[PDB]
Design a binder for this molecule. Structure first.
Ligand SMILES: CC(C)=CCSP(=O)(O)OP(=O)(O)O
Length: 294
């Protein structure tokens, strides 16, 4: 079955990258969501957020107007009350802005970590009316305006990290220059990457910004770039990129990949890479950002 193949592939990735994981957590996740994994926009992610340790996450999205993952997770015990603003945030998001899709992310050593809301691209002001957003979001209105973050294309709630991300369609001509990325990173006193990386970032169609309830500033930002096959991933930049691009499992022999380049002060600077397990994620990514499939 597809669900058994997926579970085996997930465990094999965790073993190969040395990622921490719990068999009991994987059982809980698949009891709730394994069927969803078989026929939606499913991806396996690895990231090198920690020193000499790779973490493994699995995630999916699907085109429903309602947040099915929240109900499944609550009924399943994967999402308990946190005693925290996150407890109502996703519900407020779905009340404030109509969604065309939703998704959910799981850490295989922990359980459910994120749920996201996918609207049609909307003006970022539509988000400011959400009651339980961190105060730092509304406090960054001028920052958003200055860096052409006006086209909101997703929102995420991170229940484990107690943070929220706003996602922007990086449509503006200034976002096609390397100086834009140097400027936005320097505005936060974040680490500026090499020229090679900057030349990859100028093609980013999606920019995420992370906010939390413990600081007035941006926690980290992330630049997303997609690659249509294993070979066009920039494997030479980091050994996790090379190993995952060459060895990640999928239902197709040569799948596409989504790479997230994260930057922070703390740490917050690392790479994330997701395999398009069924082949739906990467075309969907280009289509939602009004770009042709390269
Ligand atoms: C890609 C967007 C639309 C939802 C996925 S959640 P993410 O991987 O961007 O979240 P992190 O900030 O990396 O934890």
């Amino acid at each position: 079955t597809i669900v058994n193949r997926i579970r085996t592939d997930v465990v094999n990735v965790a073993k190969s990258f040395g990622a921490e994981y719990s068999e009991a957590v994987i059982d809980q996740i698949f009891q709730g969501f394994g069927e969803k994994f078989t026929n939606t926009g499913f991806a396996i992610r690895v990231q090198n957020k920690r020193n000499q340790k790779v973490d493994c996450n699995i995630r999916y999205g699907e085109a429903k107007e309602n947040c099915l993952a929240w109900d499944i997770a609550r009924e399943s015990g994967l999402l308990s009350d946190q005693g925290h603003p996150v407890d109502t945030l996703i519900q407020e998001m779905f009340q404030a802005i109509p969604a065309i899709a939703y998704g959910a992310d799981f850490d295989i050593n922990y359980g459910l970590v994120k749920i996201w809301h996918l609207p049609k691209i909307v003006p970022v002001e539509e988000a400011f009316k959400i009651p339980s957003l961190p105060k730092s979001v509304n406090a960054h209105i001028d920052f958003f305006k200055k860096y052409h973050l006006d086209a909101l294309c997703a929102l995420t709630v991170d229940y484990r990290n107690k943070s929220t991300n706003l996602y922007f369609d990086a449509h503006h001509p200034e976002q096609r220059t390397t100086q834009f990325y140097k400027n936005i990173l320097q505005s936060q006193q974040f680490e500026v990457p090499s020229d090679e990386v900057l030349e990859i970032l100028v093609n980013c169609p999606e920019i995420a910004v992370t906010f939390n309830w413990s600081s007035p500033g941006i926690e980290r930002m992330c630049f997303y770039t997609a690659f249509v096959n294993r070979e066009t991933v920039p494997q030479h930049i980091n050994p996790v990129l090379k190993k995952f691009a060459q060895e990640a499992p999928a239902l197709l022999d040569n799948p596409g990949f989504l790479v997230g380049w994260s930057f922070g002060p703390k740490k917050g600077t690392y790479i994330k890479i997701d395999v398009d397990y069924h082949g739906l994620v990467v075309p969907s990514f280009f289509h939602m950002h009004n770009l042709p499939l390269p």
